[PDB]
Amino acid sequence: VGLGERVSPTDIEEGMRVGVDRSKYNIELPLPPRIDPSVTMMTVEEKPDVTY
Amino acid sequence: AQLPVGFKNMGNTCYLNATLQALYRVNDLRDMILNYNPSQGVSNSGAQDEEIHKQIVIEMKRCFENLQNKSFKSVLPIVLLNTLRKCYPQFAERDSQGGFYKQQDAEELFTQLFHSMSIVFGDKFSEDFRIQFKTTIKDTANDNDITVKENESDSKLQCHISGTTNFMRNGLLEGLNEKIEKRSDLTGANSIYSVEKKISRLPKFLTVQYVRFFWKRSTNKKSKILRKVVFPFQLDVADMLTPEYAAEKVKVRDELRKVEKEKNEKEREIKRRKFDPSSSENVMTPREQYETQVALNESEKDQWLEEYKKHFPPNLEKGENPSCVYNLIGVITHQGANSESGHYQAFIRDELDENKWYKFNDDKVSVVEKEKIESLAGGGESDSALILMYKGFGL
C-alpha cells in the first residue's frame, strides 16, 4: 500500500496497527500497536490496599 | 482569581478564541493589560500603526475582564476581529460568511499579537520572551570552519518535529539543529551547515511553536508532519542550558521549593472544612458558608505567588526565569491538517486548582485532567500541540 494524506515513514513499525480504507487501501492514521493489551488490561487491578 | 468560562464563538473565530485565553492565563501579562490606560500611551513612536496597536490592547482588556467573570461568557469578539483586519492584511484574507477572516493559523495570529503588546509597552514586554543563543555554525564537510555568533537572539524558539521524533522532548533537540546553506565557499562549500544553538539566557515566559505546516510535495496537498509527539506536564531544559548558566539556576530553584510546600500545606486544610457540614447557624443553607471559603482560596494563591518573586535574589535580572523548570499553563491544540477550515481547541490550567484543567471547546466548558493532556499520543490520532505556553515557576 502507501501513505494517505501524509503518513511519516517513522510512525509505521513492525507490529504497529494501521487504519486503512475499505477498498482504496491507504494508511490514514497509524494506530497504537496491538489490540491484545486492551483485552488483558481489564484483568489488571491496581495497588490493592490492606492494613498490615 | 475567578474561574475562566466559555469564550463567545460565532463561527470561524475558534483559533482566535483559543489564543486570547492562552495569553490571559499568564499572571503578569494579565495585570499589565488591566493596568493599561491610553494616558500612558505607546512606549514606541517607531511605528506608523502606533494608534491601532493601543486599540487592540484595549479590546483584549475587555475580553480579559469578562473572561474571568463567571457571569459573562460573552466577551464580544466581533469588534476585536474588525480591528485586526485593519492592522494587518493577513487577517483581512480568506473568504467567508459575514466578513472575510475565516479559520487561520494560530501561529500567524500569535506573532502579530506579539508585536502589538511590544509596541505599546516597549522593551518590558519584550524582555519577558528574549532568548539569547551562543550559536556555532560548522559546516559538516568543513568542521574546521567555525563561525560564532554570541548576540544571536530570537523572541521564539522553534521545535522542529520533522526528522525522526517521537516526543516533544526529542523535538526540542532536533529544533536546535536547524540547517541552512550558504552560497559562499569562503565559509567552506555549499553543503548543509550544522547549526547548533545553546541557550545562555532564558526569558521569564517561553513560547514553543511547532513547526510542521508544509506542502507535502508527493501528494500535492497541504499536510502537517504526522509524527508522534508527547508533551509531559513538567518541562526541564537543563541539558540545553550551557553548563555555566545552568548552575545558577539550580541554586535559585531551591528557595522556590520551600514556598511550594507551605502553599500545599494550607491547601489541604481548606478541603476538610467544606467536607463537614455547616452545623448550627440556623435556617441557613451550607452553600453560604462554602462560597466564602472558595473566595479565601483564590486570594491565598495569588499571595503565594508574590512570595516566590520577593525571595528571588536582587542579582536576578528582569527578563530572566528564576529556574530551569517551567509549568504548562496553556495548550493551543490543532486538529485537521488544513488550517483553511481546521478547528482549534483550547486547554487552560485551572486557576483555583492548578491540578485541574478546563478544556475550553470554545463556549462550551468541560472538565478534563492534567493527566488527560499527558496521555495524548499527539499526531492526528488525537488533538496535538501547535503552540505551547510555559510559565516560569512561581511567577
Place this chain on the structure above:
Amino acid sequence: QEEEKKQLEEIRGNPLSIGTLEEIIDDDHAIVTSPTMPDYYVSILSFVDKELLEPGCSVLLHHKTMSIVGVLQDDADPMVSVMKMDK
C-alpha cells in the same frame, strides 16, 4: 415519543451486526472487534452516552458504516437464560 421513533428508523437500516467495545479513545471514536477477523476503528455516532459506555460492553453497530448506534445487549448470551431458572 415521536422524536425517538423517527430518528431510530432513519439511522437504523437493519440488520445490525453486533460488536464488543474493546477500548475508547476520547475523540468519539472507539475500537471494537466485529465477528469478522478484521476489526474496525469506528466513530461513536448518536444515542448512547460516551460515559455510559465502559470497555467490555457488547454494542450495536450499524451495518452500512459501523458506528455505535446504542446498546440494548449487555453481553446477552443464551447461556444466562438457560441457567436462569427462578421459576
